[PDB]
């Protein structure tokens, strides 16, 4: 099986006012998709025109995640009100690819060609851009030195070329960085400001749509602890629109005005159950296909086009009482209760909203965050705040990459946390099909430690499931 939606929550929260998100509609989701495509195209053009490189692979997606750590703006996907304006994530990634991206190397000839390509690009940079005399002579020295060695008869393995390249990059990098720093900062700021303008246009289109539906957007003390429940929207949803569904080779194909999105039949059936469990404004499923269309399109837009193995979730539930994923989507969730990036659309399918906004007083949780350093670091701060704030049983079992060279602040801080009860590293070789190692950290307050202690037997059962 791929999920266990029968497991009830043990997450406990203060009851919530309904959220103010504008209710989703395919016409708006399509516009957001089109503008996000244009934004990616602007990013490509800025990287090419200003630095002669392709956008670092997956950097835009990580930018979306880092921006949402600080974004106070009105769009569920795109950023528009962020301090600082310049993303440290996008800045870091672009700078690492200047003057060229270091590709993956398999052959010694490709290692030799990359060494040459770096030296040549560094020289082109020094000859054509504003650079201090000191930085110019250092880069020039190192480049001509590499060129003279390459032009000679030499002896090197691919490892020797790569180390030669690493040493040349070591010598040139600080100087190349100082040359490009202001230009790269300008790419980061410009793409943010274009995004904010797109957010404004999407917002105006969405408000106009609601007004056309005669739906008002202008619409109490919360003093009880309740078991968690999906995010509810205060604004009435607009009427369903025409979305056509048919199946092709066990793929659900959903068409809105000629725009097709696809999801596997298994995921479609899962979404139908999640909706039955999570949606309270649509008893005859009239809005269901509209919302599935928005959901699929939203997640396709987010990424541009893995989860723990099921036996691990089973063992987390049986051995440590886990009922809830801090990082998930309706498509990948194992439990019917989870946090996700997009409560405006995911709440209908069980989302409790984004994790940094989620405030559990109690519960046993799993957390497998996106590979985003800034989100991971904010996650840890949030863990420590929650664990210190409540005396009810609270446990987080956290899976992050073994980033050691260099370390990432989230892992370093979790290893120094006063709430750490156990830690281990797990290599994994069995990966599920869908038709080095992982650091596992147990953070628990005293009550959670008493209730879900990482004893030897429980850890052994968890490791037995983690192949
Ligand atoms: C391997 N690695 C990747 N990252 C983060 O992931 C981003 C993308 O790194 P990448 O090398 O472009 O791709 P990869 O993650 O698939 O290897 C980086 O800019 C970092 O934010 C890493 N961050 C830290 N601190 N340490 C690491 O060893 C490390
Ligand atoms: N702010 C946020 N809050 C909660 N989840 C988020 C988030 N930002 C991104 N995510 C989601 O985090 C998930 C990480 S993949 C996690 C897979 C699976 N639920 C597991 O626990 O193993 C993705 O679905 C991603 O969309």
From Swiss-Prot:
One MF term in the entry's GO annotations: RNA polymerase II C-terminal domain binding
Keywords, comma-separated and alphabetical: Methyltransferase, Nucleus, Transferase
Impact upon substituting residue 62 to A: Strongly reduced methyltransferase activity
GO CC field: nucleus
Domain of life (superkingdom): Eukaryota
UniProt-annotated binding residues for S-adenosyl-L-methionine: 368-371, 429-431
Consequence recorded when altering residue 429 to A: Reduced methyltransferase activity
Protein name (database record): mRNA (2'-O-methyladenosine-N(6)-)-methyltransferase
Gene: pcif1
Residues of the full protein shown: 178 to 673 of 721
């Amino acid at each position: 099986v791929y999920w266990d939606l029968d497991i009830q929550t043990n997450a406990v929260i203060r009851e919530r006012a309904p959220a103010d998100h504008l209710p989703p509609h395919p016409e708006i989701e399509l516009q957001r998709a089109q503008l996000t495509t244009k934004l990616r195209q602007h990013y490509h053009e800025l990287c090419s025109q200003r630095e002669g490189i392709e956008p670092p692979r997956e950097s835009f997606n990580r930018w979306l995640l880092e921006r949402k750590v600080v974004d106070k703006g009105l769009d569920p996907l795109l950023p528009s009100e962020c301090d600082p304006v310049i993303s440290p994530s996008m800045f870091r990634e672009i700078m690492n690819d200047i003057p060229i991206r270091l590709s993956r190397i398999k052959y010694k000839e490709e290692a030799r060609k990359l060494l040459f390509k770096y030296a040549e690009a560094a020289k082109k940079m020094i000859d054509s851009r504003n650079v201090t005399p000191e930085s110019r002579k250092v880069v020039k020295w190192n480049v001509e030195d590499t060129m003279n060695w390459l032009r000679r008869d030499h002896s090197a393995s691919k490892e020797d070329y790569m180390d030669r390249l690493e040493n040349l990059r070591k010598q040139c990098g600080p100087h190349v960085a100082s040359v490009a720093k202001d230009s790269v900062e300008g790419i980061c700021s410009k793409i943010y400001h274009i995004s904010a303008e797109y957010v404004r246009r999407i917002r105006q289109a969405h408000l106009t749509l609601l007004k056309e539906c005669n739906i008002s957007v202008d619409g109490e003390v919360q003093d009880r602890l309740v078991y968690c429940y999906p995010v509810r929207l205060s604004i009435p949803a607009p009427p369903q629109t025409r979305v056509e569904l048919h199946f092709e080779n066990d793929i659900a194909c959903l068409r809105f005005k000629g725009e097709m999105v696809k999801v596997s039949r298994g995921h479609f059936n899962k979404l139908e159950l999640l909706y039955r469990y999570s949606c309270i404004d649509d008893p005859r499923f009239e809005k269901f296909l509209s919302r599935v269309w928005c959901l699929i399109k939203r997640y396709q837009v987010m990424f541009g086009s893995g989860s723990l193995p099921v036996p691990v979730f089973e063992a987390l539930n049986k051995q440590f009482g886990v009922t809830f994923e801090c990082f998930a989507s309706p498509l990948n969730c194992y439990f019917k209760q989870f946090c996700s990036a997009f409560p405006d659309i995911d709440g209908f399918f069980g989302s409790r909203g984004p994790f940094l906004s989620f405030s559990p007083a109690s519960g046993s949780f799993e957390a497998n965050p996106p590979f985003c350093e800034e989100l991971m670091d904010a996650m840890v701060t949030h863990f420590e705040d929650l664990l210190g704030r409540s005396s009810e049983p609270l446990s987080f079992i956290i899976f992050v990459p073994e980033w050691r060279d260099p370390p990432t602040p989230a892992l370093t801080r979790m290893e120094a946390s006063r709430f750490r009860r156990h830690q281990m590293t797990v290599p994994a070789f069995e990966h599920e099909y869908r038709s080095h190692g992982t650091a596992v950290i147990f953070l628990q307050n005293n009550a959670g430690f008493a209730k879900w202690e990482p004893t030897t037997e429980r850890i052994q059962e968890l490791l037995a499931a983690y192949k």
